[PDB]
Coordinates of C-alpha atoms in Angstrom, one line a residue:
Chain A
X114 CA -22.0 -269.8 43.9
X115 CA -25.0 -268.2 45.6
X116 CA -23.4 -264.8 45.3
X117 CA -26.3 -262.6 44.4
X118 CA -26.7 -260.8 47.7
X119 CA -27.0 -257.0 47.7
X120 CA -24.0 -255.2 49.3
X121 CA -23.5 -251.6 50.6
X122 CA -21.4 -249.5 48.2
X123 CA -19.7 -246.1 48.7
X124 CA -21.1 -242.9 47.2
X125 CA -19.1 -239.8 46.1
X126 CA -19.6 -236.1 45.5
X127 CA -18.4 -236.5 41.9
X128 CA -21.7 -237.6 40.5
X129 CA -20.4 -240.9 39.3
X130 CA -21.5 -244.5 39.9
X131 CA -21.6 -246.0 43.4
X132 CA -18.6 -248.3 43.9
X133 CA -17.8 -251.3 46.0
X134 CA -15.2 -250.9 48.7
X135 CA -12.8 -253.5 47.5
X136 CA -14.0 -256.4 45.5
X137 CA -15.3 -258.8 48.1
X138 CA -18.6 -259.3 49.9
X139 CA -20.1 -261.9 52.3
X140 CA -23.2 -263.7 51.0
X141 CA -24.9 -266.7 52.3
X142 CA -21.8 -268.3 53.9
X143 CA -19.5 -267.5 51.0
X144 CA -16.8 -264.9 50.5
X145 CA -18.0 -263.6 47.1
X146 CA -16.0 -261.7 44.5
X147 CA -17.4 -258.9 42.4
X148 CA -17.3 -259.6 38.6
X149 CA -14.2 -258.6 36.6
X150 CA -14.7 -255.0 35.4
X151 CA -16.8 -253.9 38.4
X152 CA -16.3 -250.4 39.7
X153 CA -14.6 -250.2 43.1
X154 CA -12.6 -248.1 45.5
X155 CA -9.2 -249.1 46.7
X156 CA -8.6 -247.4 50.1
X157 CA -5.6 -247.6 52.3
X158 CA -5.9 -249.1 55.7
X159 CA -5.6 -245.5 57.1
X160 CA -8.3 -244.2 54.8
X161 CA -10.7 -246.9 55.9
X162 CA -10.1 -246.2 59.5
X163 CA -11.4 -242.6 59.2
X164 CA -14.0 -243.3 56.5
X165 CA -17.3 -241.6 57.5
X166 CA -20.5 -240.0 56.2
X167 CA -18.7 -237.1 54.4
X168 CA -15.5 -237.2 52.2
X169 CA -12.3 -236.6 54.2
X170 CA -9.8 -238.1 51.8
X171 CA -9.1 -238.6 48.1
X172 CA -10.4 -242.1 47.2
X173 CA -8.7 -244.1 44.5
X174 CA -11.1 -245.5 41.9
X175 CA -10.4 -249.0 40.6
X176 CA -11.7 -251.8 38.5
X177 CA -12.2 -255.3 40.0
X178 CA -10.0 -258.0 38.6
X179 CA -9.9 -261.5 40.2
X180 CA -10.7 -259.9 43.5
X181 CA -8.2 -257.0 43.4
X182 CA -9.4 -253.4 43.0
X183 CA -6.9 -252.3 40.3
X184 CA -6.5 -248.6 40.6
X185 CA -7.0 -246.6 37.4
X186 CA -5.7 -243.2 38.5
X187 CA -9.0 -241.4 39.0
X188 CA -9.6 -239.9 42.4
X189 CA -13.0 -239.2 44.0
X190 CA -14.4 -237.7 47.2
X191 CA -16.0 -240.9 48.5
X192 CA -18.1 -241.4 51.6
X193 CA -20.4 -244.0 53.2
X194 CA -24.1 -243.6 53.9
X195 CA -25.4 -245.6 56.9
Chain B
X46 CA -27.3 -227.6 45.7
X47 CA -26.1 -231.1 44.7
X48 CA -28.5 -234.0 45.0
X49 CA -27.6 -237.7 44.6
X50 CA -25.7 -237.6 47.9
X51 CA -29.1 -238.7 49.3
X52 CA -29.4 -241.9 47.1
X53 CA -29.4 -245.3 48.9
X54 CA -26.2 -247.2 48.6
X55 CA -27.3 -250.9 48.5
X56 CA -26.4 -252.4 45.1
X57 CA -26.3 -255.7 43.3
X58 CA -23.0 -256.7 41.8
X59 CA -24.3 -260.1 40.6
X60 CA -27.7 -261.5 39.7
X61 CA -29.6 -264.7 40.1
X62 CA -29.0 -266.4 36.8
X63 CA -32.0 -268.9 36.5
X64 CA -35.7 -268.1 36.9
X65 CA -37.1 -268.7 40.4
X66 CA -40.7 -269.9 40.5
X67 CA -43.1 -267.4 42.0
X68 CA -44.2 -269.9 44.7
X69 CA -40.7 -269.7 46.2
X70 CA -40.8 -265.9 46.5
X71 CA -42.3 -263.5 49.0
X72 CA -44.0 -260.1 48.3
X73 CA -40.8 -258.2 49.0
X74 CA -39.6 -255.9 46.2
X75 CA -37.0 -253.1 46.4
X76 CA -35.5 -251.2 43.5
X77 CA -31.9 -250.3 43.9
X78 CA -30.5 -246.8 43.3
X79 CA -30.2 -245.7 39.7
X80 CA -26.6 -244.7 40.8
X81 CA -25.7 -248.4 41.2
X82 CA -23.4 -249.9 38.6
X83 CA -26.1 -252.4 37.6
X84 CA -29.8 -251.9 37.4
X85 CA -31.4 -254.4 39.8
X86 CA -34.4 -255.3 41.9
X87 CA -34.2 -257.2 45.2
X88 CA -36.7 -260.0 45.9
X89 CA -36.9 -262.2 49.0
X90 CA -37.2 -265.9 49.0
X91 CA -39.6 -267.8 51.3
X92 CA -36.6 -268.5 53.4
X93 CA -36.2 -264.8 54.0
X94 CA -33.1 -264.5 51.8
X95 CA -32.7 -261.3 49.7
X96 CA -31.8 -262.0 46.1
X97 CA -30.6 -259.8 43.3
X98 CA -32.6 -260.0 40.1
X99 CA -32.0 -258.4 36.7
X100 CA -35.1 -256.4 35.5
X101 CA -34.1 -256.8 31.9
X102 CA -34.9 -260.6 32.1
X103 CA -38.4 -261.5 31.2
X104 CA -39.2 -263.6 34.3
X105 CA -38.3 -260.6 36.6
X106 CA -40.6 -258.3 34.7
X107 CA -43.3 -261.0 34.9
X108 CA -42.9 -261.3 38.7
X109 CA -43.0 -257.5 39.2
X110 CA -46.1 -257.3 37.1
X111 CA -47.7 -260.1 39.2
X112 CA -46.7 -258.2 42.4
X113 CA -48.5 -255.1 41.0
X114 CA -52.1 -256.3 40.6
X115 CA -52.5 -257.4 44.2

């Protein structure tokens, strides 16, 4: 699995690690999955629709497990940087 | 004033496992943000494909050292 492509992550104003939006990324013709344990955000469809360059919603932190961003209860002010 | 909102957000979630010979790589080198989950450097193959490399592995440090001195 040639799944070693870089991918855009989301930042936050909380001073914690950048996190993948969900647990999947496209790389060299393959739908790749982040490794189990990897930090992620699990956003609702509505939250993704309005995601922008500053936080405007409380973003659920999660941990990737077999492709699912399993929420852990921590909430962060996440945003995307173009 | 908070900083770190200005960090770049491209990160490597997986690495190339096996060593890639230097003849297959270009002169491209980009260090990812220290805010990324995993410390990584991005190289580019001669087919213009960006690849994630782990700078704790010895061949990666070797290639970066080679890229330094011309």
